[PDB]
Subunit: 255 residues, 3 copies
């Protein structure tokens, strides 16, 4: 199960039923949980923390030092949860003093060449397409779908159930449930496909749609739009999430 | 020739005059032909089928399972033909039940970081630039030139002798002999450079140009344009290929 | 310090205090200087020349043959200077007969997946973001900052102290001190942040700004603009660099 042609530092903590292929390099100050599969030529570096049930494909590199030139050798981690699919040449750098922990949650698919920068936060249930780049200290909420070659600027946040189209770039926040596409990036309606596929009622889908008509298509400023959403759209946790997300947006939201 | 620092599963079938560098990982249920060069730290996984005369550069990964979450562990292959140049960190995933075979033909250059998704089909004589992403079940016809960072949506088809400019993205078919560029992507004239370089007569080049003036610049709908091309452009296999390609286009063609 | 699980050709020349991790592959006709750190699964190929004080991250490939099909097996090199940070899966191909040497200077950061094509030239003090692609025979002057997923066409040149925004592409030269952004790419003002951060006087910053108002915003052709800059902007090495760079631009400059 553990190949003798892997290099595993004697201090690495490794759980049960872990398969490690040849030419895997595992450093000290590494924690790996149970039921993991680490394929050939993958690299698990100082500071990595890996949960249970993951598969790490060839050439992935977890835990390399930040690409941030503000990094000065401080202790930090790079972490993934459970049941993730970490594809070929995915990079997850460890954190900086700005936070200290780069964290990926559970049940994500990070397609080949995806980059997760220092102090970034990915939730659960996300799909991130080929060679998408998540810059420093970003946040991705649960259940987001991001296509390939997307550029997510530092400190941005993506809401749940968003679909971001391939090749888009953005430096504002993306509120929950929407499609974001075009250049420059833009609100492009609701992720009806994703929501239907996940079992949301047609009624809740229509409410979400109506909230975003108010927000984007009624000529109102943000405050007034959110007031009107609160007054006129049948309330539900989905609608409150839209409102709270926008109302507290650190960067502002995309157009 | 075969390095003792490679890992090669005893069941892998390997042809003659095959050079295998250190830290290459070759699985079972692999077929490799004659006269291949597999460089250091490359990965040839379960289900790979490799022809003759190829060079596989460091960090390439052939045969990993689909990135498609519809994959359920079905048997499939990832295949390349003869005389290809498979550059650094190129990924060619094996197929899904949708087809079962990811296939690359002969005499292609796949530049570093290029991704070939499950069930994709590449023909012969193609050049695909750095980190271009070919999504599920795409088709690339012979002799195409695709630049870097191109995003080719699932189920699309690219015709022969096209040049696609760097950074473009598309979700319709690209008909043969054209330049496709800009954002949003657009017909941008004929690949005169490529056609001249390959020895096409000036007369045939002019006919191709005239067919596309009819198709794109005459205000006609697709049917009427193709009717007029058939009536007015001196017929040749090139012109019939343009017509047939558009007439049977599954997605429609780009603007 | 030198891992026994590395492969190092007996002819490779390796300096003092060099750390080499497991699964590193080092060819013959390689020169490596002092105080280098080469991490796991990196590849240093025939023709590489490495200076002092660098760190080469996992999966980087230095010295592979050109991706140029005009290459016919001629001797060439791939070179880096001192104190560079060469991140995961960075590719630096060796040269062709067009020049013969791919050269990277000192004190650069090349973020993961960056490609440096045959005969390219990078100076000193540059930062090049994730998966940026530098095509054949490009030139990057000192102190440039290039974001992620940038596409730099063959034979282009980037001036010092430029900031190029993420996802941009260009096939003309970028003159010194500017921000280049949008699609299509465009002059987007001065890199005031970068210049201030590096200690340039407010007065010199204002002069640079005034030269570019003349160049881009006064309706003058290139010659007349440069004449007026020479006549009206207080002269300094910065202003002479702007003028000389544009005046001798091989491709023309971006809009
Ligand atoms: Ca790699």
């Amino acid at each position: 199960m553990i190949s003798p042609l892997a290099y595993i530092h004697p201090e690495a903590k490794i759980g049960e039923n872990v398969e490690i292929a040849p030419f895997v390099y595992i450093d000290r100050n590494v924690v790996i949980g149970d039921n993991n599969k680490i394929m050939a030529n993958a690299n698990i570096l100082y500071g990595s923390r890996i949960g249970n049930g993951n598969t790490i494909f060839p050439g992935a590199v977890i835990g390399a030092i930040p690409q941030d030139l503000k990094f000065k050798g401080e202790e930090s981690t790079a972490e993934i949860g459970d049941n993730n699919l970490i594809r070929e040449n995915v990079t997850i750098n460890r954190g900086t003093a700005a936070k200290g922990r780069t964290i990926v949650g559970n049940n994500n698919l990070l397609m080949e060449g995806v980059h997760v920068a220092h102090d970034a936060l990915i939730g659960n249930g996300c799909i991130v397409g080929n060679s998408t780049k998540m810059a420093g200290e970003i946040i991705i909420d649960d259940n987001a779908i991001i296509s390939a070659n997307v550029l997510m600027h530092q400190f941005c946040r993506v809401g749940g159930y968003v679909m971001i189209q391939g090749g888009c770039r953005f430096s504002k926040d993306i509120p929950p449930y929407i499609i974001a596409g075009r250049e420059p990036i833009a609100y492009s309606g609701i992720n009806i496909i994703g929501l239907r596929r996940r079992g949301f009622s047609n009624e809740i889908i229509e409410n979400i749609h109506n909230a975003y008509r108010i927000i984007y298509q009624s000529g109102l400023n943000t405050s007034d739009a959110l007031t009107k959403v609160e007054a006129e759209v049948p309330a539900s946790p989905e609608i409150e999430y839209i409102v709270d997300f926008i109302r507290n947006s650190e960067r502002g939201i995309i157009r």
